[PDB]
């Protein structure tokens, strides 16, 4: 994506009803800090999800260690809060060649203060004045009270610790809802083969067959409630099972 917002107004995209391309995630390998939870990253290729939340933002190259489920520091204190029990992956890389511009990048922002720690996964776009001392400023700025937000200072004159990371966070769950988002061998003809089609499993001799399905159908069956004939998913064809 071409434009991530800051952490005071981070973008969130509910994703479901599609398939996961988890391969090139690992094959990318241009990513600085790439960690996961729940169960191992090699294991998550197939172990799949009811409803994922893909939310992304841009933070500094020093504060990204604050992004960890159950830590402190400003981004996890007042800006964006990972929960106490978390599943997803934190994906983090540098975008110094895009974000930090000569003449100064000050598009990006963050919240520096709030009168409590932040509830998990809840943004804070309320840019009203907080009153640290007791003297009421009441919407306008003043004494004992500060402005809530502040920018970052990004230029390519920054060191490597001050480079902008485009942290995208993937968060997962499991419900009574089915695995709506879920990740992914040459067929044998006229030869005894073990097989699986679409999860249907058995062992037989697969042949070409002229029995004619209705389109929506999957299996055929015989009188005996055996699985007699199946249709090849990738290339629709009517395959007997003997």
């Amino acid at each position, epitope marked *: 994506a071409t434009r991530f917002a800051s952490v005071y107004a981070w973008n969130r995209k509910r994703i479901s009803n599609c398939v996961a391309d988890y391969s090139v995630l690992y094959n990318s390998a241009s990513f600085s800090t790439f960690k996961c939870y729940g169960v191992s990253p090699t294991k998550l290729n197939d172990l799949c999800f009811t409803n994922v939340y893909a939310d992304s933002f841009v933070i500094r190259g020093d504060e990204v260690r604050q992004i960890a489920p159950g830590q402190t520091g400003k981004i996890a204190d007042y800006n964006y809060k990972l929960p106490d029990d978390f599943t997803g992956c934190v994906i983090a890389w540098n975008s110094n060649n895009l974000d930090s511009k000569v003449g100064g990048n000050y598009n990006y922002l963050y919240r520096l203060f709030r009168k409590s720690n932040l509830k998990p996964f809840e943004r804070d776009i309320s840019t009203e*004045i907080y009153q640290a001392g007791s003297t009421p400023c*009441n919407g*306008v700025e003043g*004494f004992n009270c*500060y*402005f809530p937000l502040q920018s970052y200072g990004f230029q390519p004159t920054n060191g490597v610790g001050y480079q902008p990371y485009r942290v995208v966070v993937l968060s997962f769950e499991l419900l009574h809802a089915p695995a709506t988002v879920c990740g992914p061998t040459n067929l044998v003809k006229n030869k005894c083969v073990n097989f699986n089609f679409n999860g249907l499993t058995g062992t037989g001799v697969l042949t070409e067959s002229n029995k004619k399905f209705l389109p929506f159908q999957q299996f055929g069956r015989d009188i005996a409630d055996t699985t007699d004939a199946v249709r090849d998913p990738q290339t629709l064809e009517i395959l007997d099972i003997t």
Partner: antibody
Amino acid sequence: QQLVESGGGVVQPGRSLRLSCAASGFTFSSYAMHWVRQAPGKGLEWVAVISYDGSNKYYADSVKGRFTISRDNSKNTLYLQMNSLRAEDTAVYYCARHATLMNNKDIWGQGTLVTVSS
Amino acid sequence: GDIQLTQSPSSLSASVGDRVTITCRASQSISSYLNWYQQKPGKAPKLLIYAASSLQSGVPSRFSGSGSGTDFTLTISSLQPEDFATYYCQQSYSTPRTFGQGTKVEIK
């Protein structure tokens, strides 16, 4: 990034003249905004605030003429109607912002002349 | 009542390469909430220092702020031929805000 102002002109005293000032580059919406006055040869005198992030309006009691201030946030614009005029207010006005130890957002309009004379 | 400012001196005709200390004094004890502006007469007031002790983008350290409480200081150093203009201090402590009367640094 940029601030534009409504047109100044010569107005008879006791009248009213709405002041429009539209923003560009970044919104009015998340910030406050101010008005200040510069008479020729005189110092910059603050006039009035606006505070959109709640809603509150503060006026200078030095020039307490009920110069009313409110918004058009969706156009990033701000309206202060010149009420209860008197000739020494004949000056140039600016749309303003104060760096309150946190930001660096002090952006100033181009300046238009209000004139109070018959 | 209001908070009075005291900008001293209200003008100082200066020369090349000086180090001018334009003082803005305050009637109350203000934490650091004071600013500084560049105005050639007819321009927009270009902010110079924020919170009385911090520089600004585009403005090098030839300007330099310090002070707190009542006493605030504009530390102009190595005075440049473009720096000769009408300048201003600024409270943001309470409401109303007042600005100083201005100090015109000008060529001797």
